[PDB]
């Protein structure tokens with residue numbers, strides 16, 4: 001409706017794009033009119049910009065419908081994906097999950113967001129369990145502290161503590177590709 005309606009995660013229809021408010025601030029400069037600064041992220045492209053607004057100016061929002069979805073596979077071109085409730089099978093851009101698509105497994109439960117029935121983007125869980133394809137031998141005398149590169153079953157690489165071995169199943173933070181913990185048998 002207006003700038004007063006601004007909060008983080010709110011998505012605007014603006015100059016032909018759909019842009020999420022990542023950060024906003026109402027500003028009273030103490031000389032002249034108030035205005036708003038918004039850090040905006042194109043939800044599709046991921047490109048972020050800084051924009052300013054005349055305080056109280058009309059804005060137009062998009063309702064984003066979030067659907068619980070299962071990732072099936074990569075057909076060489078698209079991510080193939082099934083809507084959990086409807087069981088409908090459709091294509092997503094390989095980019096639709098950002099850098100975190102790095103960590104998609106077959107049959108991973110994900111969320112996809114829509115405006116007027118068109119997929120905008122997908123999200124993995126914050127934590128996912130991925131197996132180690134390869135890392136250097138485990139060192140239990142912590143003897144090499146620090147971390148070593150590990151290659152996950154997806155081909156994604158992360159830093160892991162020295163005690164990790166090939167075949168270990170790790171918990172991984174998808175927000176920044178960081179080691180969380182080792183899953184036990």
Ligand code: NA
Nearest residue numbers: 074101102104
């Ligand atoms: Na992939």
